[PDB]
Amino acid sequence: AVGRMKFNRSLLREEIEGSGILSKDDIIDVMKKLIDIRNGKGEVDDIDHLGNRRIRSVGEMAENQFRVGLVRVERAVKERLSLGDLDTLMPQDMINAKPISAAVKEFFGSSQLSQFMDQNNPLSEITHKRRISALGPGGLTRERAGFEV
C-alpha cells in the first residue's frame, strides 16, 4: 500500500492509496514519463536520498515471516479442504504448530542480522541494539556492485 502510494505519486496519481496489483494504465503512464525524460522531462532518482529508502523493523520482519508461514499454511488448508470436505472435525485437521514454530525460529535465529548480544560495554551493548545497516535480505544485497553507496 505504501508501494502503491509511491507508484501513484510517481504517476502523480492523487489517490495514492492503492493495492499491490498492477494495471496497464500505470504502465502506459510510466512509458510516457520515461520517453519524456529521454526527450527531457526531469531528473533521475537518487538512492542516496533518504526519501528513496523504506526501512524495515524487527516487528515488521516478524510479521513478514508470520505472513510467509501463513501463506503456506493457508495453501495446505485449502488443499486439505478440497479433498474430503465432508467432515465436521475441529479446526485442527491442518493445525501444524510445528511449521509455524520452525518458521519463527528461522526468522529469529537463522538470519545474518540475528546475532548474540554484545555487552562488552553496556554502551557497546546498547549500540549493538542501536545497529542500523543495509546488509541482509534487501538493502545491501551484495557487498560488491557499488561505490557511491
Binding site: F116, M117, D118, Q119, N120, N121, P122, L123, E125, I126
Partner: protein
C-alpha cells in the same frame, strides 16, 4: 567514572538496562548481598500490593564475551528510595555512570625514548595500584552422552 564527563553517562547507564530500576519503590529496607527487600509507600503500594519489592539478581554472571557481569547495590537498608531508581550497579558502573575508563594522572612528554609513537609506559606504583585489573569468566560443560555400551 573517568575524571572528565560529557553529560550523558548517567543517562547511558540508565538506558543500558543492566542495573535494576526501583520500579515503583519508596524505601529500601532489607537489601542483602542478593536479597533486596524494599518497601514502597502505601500510595505507591498499589492496592492488593504490599509495595514490598524483592530483588534477586544474578551475581557474577559469566558474560558472553567471557567477561564478568555482576550487579552491585549502592543502598544498604532503610532509605527512602525514589521510584524507578537504579538499585545495583552493573559492569563499568560507578555511582550509576557507565564509564569503562580510569583517569590516571599522567604526562605527555617522551622520555628516554623508551616509549615510541605507539607505546604506553606505566609505573610500578600504578602496577600495584590494581587499576584495570580484569575479571574474565570461562566456561566448561560436560554431558552424559548415553550409549548402548
Amino acid at each position: 567514572k573517568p575524571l572528565v564527563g560529557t553529560g550523558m553517562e548517567r543517562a547511558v547507564a540508565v538506558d543500558s538496562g543492566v542495573t535494576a530500576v526501583a520500579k515503583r519503590g519508596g524505601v529500601v529496607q532489607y537489601v542483602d548481598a542478593s536479597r533486596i527487600v524494599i518497601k514502597v509507600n502505601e500510595d505507591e503500594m498499589y492496592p492488593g500490593e504490599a509495595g514490598i519489592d524483592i530483588y534477586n539478581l544474578t551475581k557474577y554472571t559469566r558474560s558472553n564475551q567471557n567477561t564478568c557481569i555482576n550487579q552491585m547495590p549502592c543502598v544498604s537498608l532503610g532509605e527512602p528510595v525514589e521510584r524507578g531508581d537504579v538499585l545495583a550497579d552493573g559492569p563499568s558502573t560507578d555511582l550509576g555512570e557507565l564509564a569503562l575508563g580510569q583517569n590516571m594522572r599522567v604526562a605527555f612528554m617522551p622520555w628516554n625514548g623508551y616509549n615510541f609513537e605507539d607505546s604506553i609506559l606505566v609505573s610500578e606504583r600504578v602496577v600495584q595500584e590494581d587499576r584495570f585489573t580484569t575479571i574474565h569468566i570461562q566456561e566448561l560443560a560436560c554431558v552424559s552422552r548415553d550409549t548402548k555400551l
